[PDB]
């Protein structure tokens, strides 16, 4: 518990990277967040939207 | 560009389309800048 | 069938060639809502219902 500052600096960066990775799974309104679903299911004029 | 085509196929004369006219007859580029003008011509083209 | 008692067929355990459907100009509409009809022949599905 003395080294709470340094271990928090490690934790903040780990939480930031893990948040950034987990956001790859978010749809943001797309039909899927797996980019290969979109590219395999949709033809270019729909896929680009 | 100009031609006579069957009325049900006119939907294929656009960017991104598919079917026999768009695949083998005449294909627009997918970034086409232009106007597509068509009319039913059965009073003159039919024979 | 009638529209109040609409018919469902489960379609399963097969190849299906959707180009054979999409090529039929009799289909006055063929609107698809999460797949494009050109792409269907490169997919495979866990079930299909007609």
From Swiss-Prot, chain B:
Lineage top rank: taxon: Viruses
Ranges for region Integrin-binding motif: 6-8
Result of changing residue 47 to T: In strain: Omicron/BQ.1.1
Subunit structure, as described in the record: Binds to host ACE2. RBD also interacts with the N-linked glycan on 'Asn-90' of ACE2. Cleavage of S generates a polybasic C-terminal sequence on S1 that binds to host Neuropilin-1 (NRP1) and Neuropilin-2 (NRP2) receptors. Interacts with host integrin alpha-5/beta-1 (ITGA5:ITGB1) and with ACE2 in complex with integrin alpha-5/beta-1 (ITGA5:ITGB1). May interact via cytoplasmic c-terminus with M protein. May interact (via N-terminus) with host bilirubin and biliverdin, thereby preventing antibody binding to the SARS-CoV-2 spike NTD via an allosteric mechanism.
Protein's job: Attaches the virion to the cell membrane by interacting with host receptor, initiating the infection. The major receptor is host ACE2. When S2/S2' has been cleaved, binding to the receptor triggers direct fusion at the cell membrane. When S2/S2' has not been cleaved, binding to the receptor results in internalization of the virus by endocytosis using host TFRC and GRM2 and leading to fusion of the virion membrane with the host endosomal membrane. Alternatively, may use NRP1/NRP2 and integrin as entry receptors.
Protein name: Spike protein S1
Natural source organism: Severe acute respiratory syndrome coronavirus 2
């Amino acid at each position: 518990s003395a080294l709470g500052k340094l271990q928090d600096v490690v934790n903040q960066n780990a939480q930031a990277l893990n948040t950034l990775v987990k956001q790859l799974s978010s749809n943001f309104g797309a039909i899927s967040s797996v980019l290969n679903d979109i590219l395999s299911r949709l033809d270019k004029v729909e896929a680009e939207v | 560009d100009s031609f006579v085509i069957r009325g049900d196929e006119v939907r294929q004369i656009a960017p991104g389309q598919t079917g026999k006219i768009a695949d083998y007859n005449y294909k627009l580029p997918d970034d086409f800048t232009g106007c597509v003008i068509a009319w039913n011509s059965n009073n003159l083209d039919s024979k | 069938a009638s529209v109040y008692a609409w018919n469902r067929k489960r379609i399963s355990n097969c190849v299906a060639d959707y180009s054979v459907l999409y090529n039929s100009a009799s289909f006055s509409t063929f609107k698809c809502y999460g797949v494009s009809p050109t792409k269907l022949n490169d997919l495979c599905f866990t079930n299909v219902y007609a």
